[PDB]
């Protein structure tokens, strides 16, 4: 596959999904915008492969990969990337 898929929780999810389960665009892990988060950035989590706004699981939530949303409703949510390790 093009490797836009997660392995388990998405800890080694090296994909490029950029939307929550709703399709709400994931914010840039790098951007505090419009959700300021000096956490789960590429620079605070240089082990979970956080690039741009592509979904990731820095914490390896056992529910799956997530991101921060550009949605003024919630700070973060889960993404909808298929299981690569399946």
Domain boundaries in the chain? 1-86
Q: Interior CA angle at 16 toward 61 and 80, to 5°?
A: 50
Distance (Å, whole) CA 64 – CA 83: 9
End-to-end CA distance of the chain: 12
Experimental technique behind these coordinates:
NMR
Fold category of 1-86 in CATH: Plasminogen Kringle 4 (2.40.20)
Give the phi and the psi of residue 73 in degrees, each rounded to 5.
-85, -55
Enumerate the β-bridge partners of residue 26. Answer: 69
Helices vs. strands in the chain: H and E counts, helices first: 0, 2
* Length reported for the chain: 86
Give whole-number Cα distances, 73 to 23, 34, 37, 41, 45, in Å. Answer: 14, 11, 15, 20, 24
Residue 28 in tokens: 């840039």
Enumerate the β-bridge partners of residue 68. Answer: 76
């Amino acid at each position: 596959s093009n490797a836009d898929c997660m392995f388990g929780n998405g800890k080694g999810y090296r994909g490029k999904r950029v939307t929550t389960v709703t399709g709400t665009p994931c914010q840039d892990w790098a951007a505090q915008e419009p959700h300021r988060h000096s956490i789960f950035t590429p620079e605070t989590n240089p082990r979970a492969g956080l690039e741009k706004n592509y979904c990731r699981n820095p914490d390896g939530d056992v529910g799956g990969p997530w991101c921060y949303t550009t949605n003024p409703r919630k700070l973060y949510d889960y993404c909808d990337v298929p299981q690569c390790a399946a």
